[PDB]
Each structure stands twice: as structure tokens, then as C-alpha cells.
């Protein structure tokens, strides 16, 4: 999407709804979407019902309506995720984005693929902490954005 069209709809003007429709019409290959179905800024979108949109767009207004749905649930699916970086002996760095509710096996086991070594051989630490596989960034309380220690076990 266009650069404006990254931000939430409530910081949308005129110009950007319009630019909206034209980007989902031709995104969704949607019938031609009349501009002035919709002469009202983002923070006035926000307040139709979907009845709302099947009335202004009968041909699209509910496929419009779920997309802004969508739109509008990014920042709490991204409120879910935090930033991880392990760090090796050696000083390397690979990052990773987890789900805080995710078991933290899923972490472990990709990165002793990426380093062509055994599931089990490779301790993970967090703050002096072994990460079990059970473990979740949520329960261990990472911020979001935290680091995690790796070594090879003896």
C-alpha cells in the first residue's frame, strides 16, 4: 500500500480513503469503486456499520468493510510479537520475531538448524535462566525487545 495507507485509517484523510478504494480495487479486482461513495475522512470511516458499506458500495462495501477489519487489528497483532536476538559464543547474532504465547521450542530447534548442530546439544539462557522448551516470552517476562545467550552443552 501506499505510503499514507501504512498508518491507521483514524490518521486517514479525504485523499487517502480515495486512494484506499482505488489500491483494494485493484488489489481485489473489485468493480470500478466511485470516489464519491465515501466523501469522508478515516476517522469518519470508522464509524459506518457494515450496513453502512453494503449501502455505499453494494458490489464491494462488505469485502471493504472486512478489509478495514483488518486493517485495524494490525497493531494488537503486533502488540503479540516481540524481538529476539540470540547471541553465540562466537559473538554471532540471528533475530528473531516469536508470538509471546509461543513455546519457545519452535526458537530453539530453528536455530540449531540454521547451525547444522543437534537439537539438543546447544543451552539457551535468558537472564541466567535455561529456556525450556515449554517456556514462553510471555511467562519469562522478555521485553519486546530482549536477548538470549546460547552455548553448547558440555
Known amino acids: 500500500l501506499p505510503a499514507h495507507l501504512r498508518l491507521q485509517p483514524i490518521y486517514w484523510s479525504r485523499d487517502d480513503v480515495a486512494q484506499w478504494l482505488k489500491w483494494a480495487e485493484n488489489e481485489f479486482s473489485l468493480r470500478p469503486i466511485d470516489s464519491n461513495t465515501f466523501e469522508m475522512n478515516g476517522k469518519a470511516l ?10 455505499r458500495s ?3 462495501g462488505d469485502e471493504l468493510y472486512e478489509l478495514l477489519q483488518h486493517i485495524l ?18 559473538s554471532s547474532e540471528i533475530h528473531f520475531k516469536v508470538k509471546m504465547t509461543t513455546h519457545l ?3 530453539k530447534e ?4 540454521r547451525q547444522g548442530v543437534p537439537m539438543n546439544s546447544l543451552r539457551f539462557l535468558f537472564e541466567g535462566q535455561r529456556i525450556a522448551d515449554n517456556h514462553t516470552p ?13 552455548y553448547q552443552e558440555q
Open 46 to 55: 470508522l464509524l459506518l456499520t457494515k450496513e453502512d458499506f453494503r449501502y
Open 58 to 60: 453494494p458490489h464491494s
Open 73 to 90: 487489528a494490525q497493531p494488537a497483532a503486533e502488540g503479540e510479537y516481540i524481538k529476539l536476538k540470540v547471541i553465540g559464543q562466537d
Open 105 to 107: 521450542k519452535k526458537l
Open 110 to 113: 530453528s536455530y540449531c538448524q
Open 138 to 150: 510471555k511467562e519469562l517476562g522478555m521485553e519486546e525487545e530482549d536477548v538470549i545467550e546460547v
